[PDB]
Amino acid sequence: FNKDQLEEFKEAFELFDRVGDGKILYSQCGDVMRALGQNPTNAEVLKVLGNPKSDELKSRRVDFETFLPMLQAVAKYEDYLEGFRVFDGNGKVMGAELRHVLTTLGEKMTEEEVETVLAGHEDSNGCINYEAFLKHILS
Amino acid sequence: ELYTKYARVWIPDPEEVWKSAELLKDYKPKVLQLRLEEGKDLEYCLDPKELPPLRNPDILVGENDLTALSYLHEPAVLHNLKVRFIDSKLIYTYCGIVLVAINPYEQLPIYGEDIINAYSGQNMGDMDPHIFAVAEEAYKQMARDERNQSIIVSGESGAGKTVSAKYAMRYFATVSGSASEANVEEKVLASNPIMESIGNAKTTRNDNSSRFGKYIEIGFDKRYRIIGANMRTYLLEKSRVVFQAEEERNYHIFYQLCASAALPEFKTLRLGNANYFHYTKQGGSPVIDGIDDAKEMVNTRQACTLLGISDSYQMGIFRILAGILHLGNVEFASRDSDSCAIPPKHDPLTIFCDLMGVDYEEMAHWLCHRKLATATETYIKPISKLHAINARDALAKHIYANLFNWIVDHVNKALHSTVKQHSFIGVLDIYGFETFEINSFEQFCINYANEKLQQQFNMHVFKLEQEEYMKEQIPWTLIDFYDNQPCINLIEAKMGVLDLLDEECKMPKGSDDTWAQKLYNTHLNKCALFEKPRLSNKAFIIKHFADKVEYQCEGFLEKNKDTVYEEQIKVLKSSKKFKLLPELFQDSKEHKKTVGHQFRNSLHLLMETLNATTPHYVRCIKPNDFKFPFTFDEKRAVQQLRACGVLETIRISAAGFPSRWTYQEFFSRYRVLMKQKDVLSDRKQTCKNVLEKLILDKDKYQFGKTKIFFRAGQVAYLEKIRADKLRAACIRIQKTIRGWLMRKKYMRMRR
Amino acid sequence: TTALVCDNGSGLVKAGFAGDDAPRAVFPSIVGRPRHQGVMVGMGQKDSYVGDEAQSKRGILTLKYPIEHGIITNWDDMEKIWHHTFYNELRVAPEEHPTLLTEAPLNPKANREKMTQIMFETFNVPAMYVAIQAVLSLYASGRTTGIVLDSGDGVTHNVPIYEGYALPHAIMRLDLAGRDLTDYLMKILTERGYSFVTTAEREIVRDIKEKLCYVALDFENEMATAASSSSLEKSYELPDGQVITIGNERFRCPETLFQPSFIGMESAGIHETTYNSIMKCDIDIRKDLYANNVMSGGTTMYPGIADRMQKEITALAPSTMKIKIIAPPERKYSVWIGGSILASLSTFQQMWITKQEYDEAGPSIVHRKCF
């Protein structure tokens, strides 16, 4: 990262600082990385975080300088399409089925998050054009 | 290997025979790290060798066919019955062709007419399993092809055999159009309590164990409509009449008759309390808990009257049984070392005469002496007390076996109907395999009969599957018969256990000790299936299909002796007083034959009766020990599943190609694995690439023309790799959407 | 298939199937040839007669026994008797049935060789065995310990057996017999002034012996009483209805079995040869051979022989150790019954001499297997 990148990232990091000490929580590290363009899994986030325990994940605070190596480590298309084509072959996906898989497998998200991101992308049958939804969420 | 983290395995427990766990760690070629509902994180321990049984995936669990499952082993067969039986309350199940039926104690609605009609059109696969699917396949075979059809039902006597038969009979009556023409059903079900009464006995494991094979023919007109029925019976336990192990009873009808002694009708029989008589006393245990003997009596007799027995024939039969009981109390006093006598005015023989009609003096003389005839001349030879006892017990067994064959044939006179039978379907109820802490001649005969039925069962399955491979154009040499001739040749053949036991019966100064000591020369090192228990010389071990089984010799010789002296039955046959006793002995070596040789012939007729026929199978397993309206208890169900050969049908088929799939359903799930780069015009050709790429060893499966045949275990493997590729996609999407929604939370929060 | 079981001594042949309880065919072992000129034309003259024919015809015939003292003396008549037994009396082809043959111990060995050789060559019997007549009686009496006293026509022998082992060093063999009882009865009857000089007459005297002899509980008391009273004397009818009185001589004939000095043997009676056979074997055993004495063959059937021995040995043997004598009514057939039992054991089926092992080894194999 260059000075400009470090400045933009530091500003964003400080926006996530809800205590004023120039720090975020470990549990916020993933959120900051995502705001900065990274897409790590919870497993990946905990690994770059050093597999923190619940207590330090929720209350131990780190400044930007300690966060930065973790961001670096995380930082260092056809599969995405086939992955969506898994759940199709007319280019659609049931809303119920996408909801079920996103709320019951892997690193489960909440139903409200899924409703929020899926709002307006499904048609009257309850089908999502996944190439368009994917381009939208990658933009 | 197949083992990886987030895989599941079966772990042994006392409280139920297995427990489900998940792997916390990958395995490597030691300890495993395990997740359990209680004491959730544990060392697991590895035998210095095996691994825990890997667990089936949850699409397959709960299906109707136990051999559709990918991993086949005791845990999975336990589980898949458990789930339906408590959670679904679906009781009928298929294993290969064999139908597993778990006894409910609640009476389920499902047997009613509407379902019978709904089945009547539909083939063996067209429905979920139910008894009507077997009864239908039998009826369809009989109509589709002349050949008569058997149904065979196996288990402990309290496993609900009778009800599984009764509904099959309803199925025939209702489907055949035949309801007006005859009631077999009312007659069969009204006959049952008689043959339960004379046929059954308490065995220490449970009350009311049937000790004989019971076989029923249901006859049809050439229009495939019912004429009527005919019984036969096989494998009766002739030995039980005179001898019991501790905590066993003689056949119920003796106790019922003795409990009825309060009634005025039986006054002349002078029957004492049920433990006064030497044949009833020996088990020590004259009362079965939970029954009124005298109250069973009135149903027994009502069933006789409803089945057309004379009101005076009933007193005749009881007069004869009372004769046997009085006979047993005869006691011999020795004159000399080598000769013995009945003492003056001995009471029970005096009563046995007034019951049977024969003179006291000629009975008392003939009991004490054998007769020998040369061609020119004859010698009245005296016989030792120890011979005279086995003579009396042989006469008691011979009377009982004849009275039973007469009562069966009068039953047949009621059941039989005079239209000439075009063909028949036949329904058979038999004891399954039997092993107790002690095992004795009764169990050796039961286990021999079981393992001989098991040979026909094996050969029939091997025919059906060599057909199924032939139709679908595999090489059928891929799968090989499994054969228990090496064991039958030990039991049956010359220089075999039954043969050396017949030899030790006739050889002078024979005994159990010298019988075992004569077995241990011939078999013990020479034969791979005969084994000696290490700390004892009175005992021997045989590996059956099911298990190792240890047999004590101690009793085992006395039970084999039968010889009945011609004079002693000729005296009875001459008897004046009443009809039935001459009727019993109506038309040799048959008097010389030993019990084991009579049984070895009876079973061979049962086998000719079945081998005429193309059988169908039902197995009955009693899922809990205490009659609870619904519970499932895995320690019991294991013992049932082993004793009913289900686990051996499975252990055999697991070396097969048990798992068998349509090309369309194979697309139906596994297009997800298939790259649409490759997904292709022709289903039969498309998968040949995919499967041979996913599974690097071609020997593990075969391409049938219309179906695919996998070896055991590689379906769940394909399901694992599908679940992994689904998980990877779920990661990639949840990763994206998590990042997006956190960025939008950041938009909410700043602005 | 069932084996055949055959027993031949110098008296009756006994034959039958194994597993049967009594012999199917019993007939005297006699071959007879005509001694007079055939006068009638078309009489239907026959080269020889066998068994029951040689009894019925006998007056026209002369009657010859092919066995002296268990030893077959001329073979062609023995072969004729076997041929008559299998084809005519059993009516069963010997090619299909293993055969069991019985002999006295300490016979000439060639007797076993030739007896085998005829079975394999002349009847092509599929397999064969030989057993000692004394061994087979224990099966018929139900014992594995005892001393088998067995005496028919021809040989008389004792074989001790203990727990299924025989003791060759104690076997005893003698030539008192139902035959030399008959020839002594003929000799002594001459004093009452009746004479028999011919074989067919001997067959009368044999029936006189079979009906009328008995064994004296004490000899000298009844020797006095016959001097004292007619009441002992018993009378009998010849075939033609002439009638004869007989005296002390009816008991006095089987007395020779106890004192062979009367016939003129220097030997001691079957009692003392029993005792000396016991004494020949270990004092550990002996009590058991006092506890079981098994009497076989026809000559034992004289009324009161058992009581005479039970007295005689008890007097002889050490006073406290009890004696018992065991004498089953069947005993005339006990050696056959024993062969029936033995030929139906399944362990025994191993032990038939096979045709193969003969054809390799010649008759001599029988000496290896049989004893």
Ligand SMILES: C/C1=C\[C@H](C)C[C@H](C)OC(=O)C[C@H](c2ccc(O)cc2)NC(=O)[C@@H](Cc2c(Br)[nH]c3ccccc23)N(C)C(=O)[C@H](C)NC(=O)[C@@H](C)C1
């Ligand atoms: C002159 C002698 C012998 C003979 C005349 C000499 C001839 C040469 O020996 C034979 O080979 C013929 C034959 C014989 C018959 C059949 C056979 O397959 C082989 C031989 N054996 C006999 O005649 C036997 C039969 C016998 C009596 Br009974 N019990 C016995 C107990 C055991 C064994 C055999 C027997 N027999 C009567 C004798 O020995 C007489 C008592 N012996 C003598 O007086 C002495 C002085 C020697």
Ligand SMILES: Nc1ncnc2c1ncn2[C@@H]1O[C@H](COP(=O)(O)OP(=O)(O)O)[C@@H](O)[C@H]1O
């Ligand atoms: N009931 C009898 N009483 C006395 N002597 C008999 C009796 N029956 C047969 N005998 C005699 O015993 C001899 C037959 O004995 P047996 O053992 O049958 O001969 P084998 O040894 O050939 O079988 C003949 O001398 C016959 O006369």
Ligand SMILES: [Mg+2]
């Ligand atoms: Mg003899």
